[PDB]
Homo-oligomer: A and B are copies of this chain.
Amino acid sequence: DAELDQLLQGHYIKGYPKQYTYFLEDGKVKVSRPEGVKIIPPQSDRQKIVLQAHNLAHTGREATLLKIANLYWWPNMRKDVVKQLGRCQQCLITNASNKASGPILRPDRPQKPFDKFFIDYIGPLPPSQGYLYVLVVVDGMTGFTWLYPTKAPSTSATVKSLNVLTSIAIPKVIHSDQGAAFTSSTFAEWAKERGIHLEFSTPYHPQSSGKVERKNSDIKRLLTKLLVGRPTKWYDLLPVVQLALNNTYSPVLKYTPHQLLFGIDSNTPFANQDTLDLTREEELSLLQEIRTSLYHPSTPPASSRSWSPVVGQLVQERVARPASLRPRWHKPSTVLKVLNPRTVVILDHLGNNRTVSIDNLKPTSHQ
Show the binding face of A for B, using Cβ within 8 Å: 35-36, 52-53, 56-59, 62-63, 66-68, 70-71, 89-91, 93-95, 109-114, 125-126, 141, 146-147, 163-164, 166-172, 194-196, 220-228, 232, 234, 236, 238-240, 242-251, 254, 258, 260-274, 276-280, 283-284, 287-288, 323-327
B contact residues around A324 at 8 Å (CB): 125-126, 232
CA distance A109 to B271 in the complex (A): 16
- Asked if A56 and B166 sit within 8 Å, CB to CB, the answer is no
Contacts of A93 in B (CB 8 A): 228
User: How close is A300's CB to chain B, nearest CB, in angstroms?
Assistant: 15
Cβ contact of A56, chosen from B169, B244, B272, cutoff 8 A? B244
Beta-carbon contact of A169 and B228 below 8 Å? no
Contact among B109, B194, B226, B272 for A276, CB-based, below 8 A: B109
Query: Which partner residue on chain B sits nearest A167 by CB separation?
Result: B239
Q: Is the CB of A224 within 8 A of B169?
A: no
Tell me how many chains of this kind the complex includes.
4
B248:A62 contact, CB within 8 angstroms: no
Report the separation of the CA atoms of residues A134 and B260 in the bound assembly, to the nearest whole angstrom.
30
- Assembly CA distance A274 to B232 (angstroms): 48
Which of A70, A93, A220, A224 counts the most chain B CB atoms within 10 A?
A224
Given contacts A249-B63, A267-B195, A325-B126, whether A260 and B280 have CB atoms under 8 Å apart is: yes
Given A228-B93, A251-B63, A277-B325 contact (CB < 8 Å) = no
Given A62-B249, A93-B228, 13 new contacts (CB under 8 A): A52-B269, A56-B247, A62-B251, A68-B270, A89-B228, A126-B325, A168-B168, A168-B246, A169-B267, A196-B267, A260-B280, A260-B284, A261-B262
Among A67, A114, A267, the most chain B Cβ lie within 10 Å of the Cβ of: A267
Task: Tell whether, in the assembled complex, residue A170 and residue B63 are in contact, meaning their CB atoms are under 8 Å apart.
Answer: no
Cross-chain contact B325 with A227 (CB below 8 angstroms): yes
Is there contact, CB below 8 Å, between A239 and B113? no
Report whether A266 and B327 are in contact in the complex, using a CB–CB cutoff of 8 Å. Answer: no
> Do B56 and A112 have beta carbons less than 8 Å apart?
no
Task: Let me know if B267 and A172 touch, CB within 8 A.
Answer: yes
B228, B273, B325: the one contacting A220 at CB < 8 Å is: B325
**Chain B residue contacts of A221, Cβ below 8 A:** 94-95
Once the chains bind, are B36 and A270 in contact (CB under 8 Å)?
A: no
14 contacts across the A-B interface (CB closer than 8 A)? A52-B270, A56-B247, A66-B251, A90-B226, A91-B225, A168-B168, A168-B243, A169-B243, A169-B258, A170-B267, A170-B268, A195-B267, A223-B325, A261-B262
Given contacts A94-B224, A112-B264, A270-B68, contact A248 B59 (CB under 8 A): yes
Alpha-carbon distance between A266 and B263 when the two chains are bound, in angstroms? 16
Q: Is the CB of A267 within 8 A of B168?
A: no
Q: Which residue of B lies closest to A276 (CB)?
A: B109
With A225-B94, A228-B89, A287-B263 as contacts: A280 and B113 at CB distance below 8 Å: yes
A63 to chain B, nearest CB (A): 4
In the bound complex, what is the Cα–Cα distance between A166 and B238 (angstroms)? 10
> Are B220 and A262 closer than 8 Å at their CB atoms?
no
Q: Nearest chain B CB to A263's CB is how many angstroms away?
A: 4
**In the complex, chain B residues whose CB is within 8 Å of the CB of A225:** 58, 90-91, 94
Nearest opposing residue in chain B for A284, CB measure: B263
Residues of B within 8 A of A71 (CB): 270, 273
Question: B58–A222 contact, CB under 8 A?
Answer: yes
